[PDB]
Amino acid sequence: MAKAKVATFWLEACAGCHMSFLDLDERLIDLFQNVEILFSPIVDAKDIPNIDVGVLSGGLGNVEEVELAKKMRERCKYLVAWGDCAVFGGINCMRNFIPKDVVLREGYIETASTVNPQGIVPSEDIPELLPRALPIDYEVKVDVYVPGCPPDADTIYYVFKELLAGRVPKVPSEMMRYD
């Protein structure tokens, strides 16, 4: 009960920024002994609870992942941006130089042995897209930016270790990379 209350999620991430979180192999046992993991791709909760260190990887590319980022911000006090996708926009932003219609059209209609003859353009029930991929510091005020693809396990461990001691850390220059 006295443990901390982190809760992660990814928005338009390739999962590497969490894969680096699970790259904390033996130290994950100690972190779990120090923090209890609420809503996250590791736990089976569906609605984010009120949390302390709300983590977010991946930029904003859809509409659903803006809503969950806004939710996470509304329900924490420190927000940690994992990765260059959440800090600088990342690799997702490479679709910002062509319109979203053209993105969905070259990757679902004219994509080198796809066989749809009706131009389906799959926006039926799924979140459509955003016209430009953006970092999460566009709809969410961020407190600890952690840059990298992915942030190394040492850096993630440092950010968690410093946020559980009760301070807002800025990632030092000797241990920060953009990869």
Partner 1 sequence: MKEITLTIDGKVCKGVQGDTILDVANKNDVYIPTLCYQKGLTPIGACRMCVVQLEGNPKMLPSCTTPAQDGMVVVTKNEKLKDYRRQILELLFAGRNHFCMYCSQSGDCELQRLAIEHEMDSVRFPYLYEDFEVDATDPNLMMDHNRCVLCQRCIRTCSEIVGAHTLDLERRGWQAKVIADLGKRLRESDTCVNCGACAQSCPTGTITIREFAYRGRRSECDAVVESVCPLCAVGCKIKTYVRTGSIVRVEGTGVEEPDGGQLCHMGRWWLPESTERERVTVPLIREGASYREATWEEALALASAEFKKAYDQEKAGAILSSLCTDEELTLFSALFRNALKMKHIDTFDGDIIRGFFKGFMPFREQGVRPFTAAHHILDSDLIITMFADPQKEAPVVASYIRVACLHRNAKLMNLS
Partner 2 sequence: VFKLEINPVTRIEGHGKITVMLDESGHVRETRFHVTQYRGFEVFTHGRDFREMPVITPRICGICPVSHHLASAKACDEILGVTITPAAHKLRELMHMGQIVQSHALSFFHLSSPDILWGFDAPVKIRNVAGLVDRYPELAKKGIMLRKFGQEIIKTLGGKKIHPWHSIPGGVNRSLTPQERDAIAAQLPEMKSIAMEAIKLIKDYLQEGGEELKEFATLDTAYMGLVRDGYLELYDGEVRIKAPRGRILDQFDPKDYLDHIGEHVEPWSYLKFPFYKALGFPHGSYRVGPLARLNAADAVSTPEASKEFALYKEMGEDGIVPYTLYYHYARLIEALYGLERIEQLLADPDITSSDLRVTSKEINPEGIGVIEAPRGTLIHHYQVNESGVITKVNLIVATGHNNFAMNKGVEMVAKKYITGTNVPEGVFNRLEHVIRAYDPCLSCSTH
Position 134 contacts partner 1 (CB under 8 A): yes
Position 145 contacts partner 1 (CB under 8 A): yes
Reading the block at residue 127, the tokens are: 């979140």
Position 43 contacts partner 2 (CB under 8 A): yes
Rounded-to-integer distance, Cα 68 and Cα 76, Å: 12
Residue pointed to by tokens 């930016």: 145
Position 94 contacts partner 1 (CB under 8 A): yes
Under 8 Å between Cβ of 108 and 72: no
CA-based nearest residue to 81, from 140, 127, 15, 20: 140
Position 152 contacts partner 1 (CB under 8 A): no
Instruction: Choose between 37 and 92: whose C-beta lies nearer to partner 1.
Output: 92
CB of 97 to partner 1, least distance (A): 5
> Of 34, 50, 74, 116, which one interacts with partner 2 (CB under 8 A)?
116
Backbone angle region of 165, left / alpha / beta, with phi > 0 → left and psi within -120 to 50 → alpha: alpha
Per-residue binding letters, 91-110, with ligand SF4 (x by CB under 6 A): x-------------------
